Amino acid sequence: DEWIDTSKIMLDLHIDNMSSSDYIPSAIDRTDLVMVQSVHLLRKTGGRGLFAREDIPKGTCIGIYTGEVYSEQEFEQYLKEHVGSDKSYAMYVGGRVIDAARKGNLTRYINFSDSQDNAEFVETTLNRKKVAKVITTKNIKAGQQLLINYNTYEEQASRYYYFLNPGDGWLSAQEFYQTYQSQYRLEQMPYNLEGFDLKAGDRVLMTQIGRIILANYSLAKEQELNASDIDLPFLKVGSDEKILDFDEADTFTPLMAACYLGQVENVKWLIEHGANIDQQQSHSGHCPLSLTLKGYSLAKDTQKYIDIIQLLIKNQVNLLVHDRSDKTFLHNAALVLNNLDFQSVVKFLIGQNPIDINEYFTYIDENDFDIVMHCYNNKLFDKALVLLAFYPDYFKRNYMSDNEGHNQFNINAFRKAIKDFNSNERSILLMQLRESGLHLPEDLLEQLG
């Protein structure tokens, strides 16, 4: 312990905001692979993040989540007696609480995502007791940010966090631009784009590929294109002729614009050449799926937006992505798509023969409604049937499982979802439930109201 110099650990990690006696290493920490940097998006609160110093293969162990150790009772009493304390850095694992709000190691710097996470907490043993390891869940390029999914308790992450991307770094927008200066050119918007809060005459820094998308030309037709321009974002410029920093305005990529404008072949081109199909705008959350849906809602030709939905699904887009209301793709598609198109999109998903169909039916919105409850709350009976056909085990897996706590929660949520139904609306619901082929027991139909 006399042999452990945490001061040089922090210097090597570029950690500048911890006391050396607050740094708690584990024997399997890999400081050689990672580094702490500012996340420019978070500059207003001086937030940091953990980043890769080199390429990291999928499945690599990064370290142990260390911190102060409490029993659940001791930690509940800690929160009570320390004004301003929270569960921000607290992990409930192995019957204890590990809290890294004051003390811990490099793993305390990893930020949150539930749609672009590239690492995970895995339970491991450490001197006869249970803690968590951080393992990468996909390949990480040098300079990309480590992101992780965990229980954010009372922080209301969906409402208040940024939608972080692995390419969100320590550079400002201005520094970002000068790094790729040769690929960029200042343009004026040739028309309005309400999808990205742009008006004709707004100045936007964009690439050749960008220009081509806004011109509605074909990317395939072009023969001198640069590979960097694939995902180089449009950067908006302010009324004072200065670049809008990352936390002052959302950027958007070529793929995002192609999807919003309904450009099928350009979407297909951009997917194949490595565009991040799950990229999210930091403040708004808009992604290629959501922008495609928005395009659809305004479209003259709705079919091209459907073909783009099909293309994203064919390339395993994360359909579990959600907005700030906690509505997933299937939540919102049910509101925006007409019956034929909703049916058709569910058919695409069927064609992918998903392993865990239940995972789509498990994410609940801010109202506690999963996607089936969501349809019913919106009088979308035909949509509901399409989902029920899609997933027959829906009621069985979520209302009649081995977990009565969970079962009763879903039963109450369901009641909540239909609590405004009228004389007629509860009978049509009851009708389709029985000819469904779902074989619902009488006692379930009753406590469902």
Ligand SMILES: C[S@@+](CC[C@H](N)C(=O)[O-])C[C@H]1O[C@@H](n2cnc3c(N)ncnc32)[C@H](O)[C@@H]1O
């Ligand atoms: C485990 S810490 C992550 C490291 C933290 N950024 C730091 O500099 O110490 C979790 C806290 O980081 C911030 N955070 C993590 N992910 C975030 C996100 N996606 N958007 C906004 N803030 C985030 C929140 O303040 C949260 O309470």
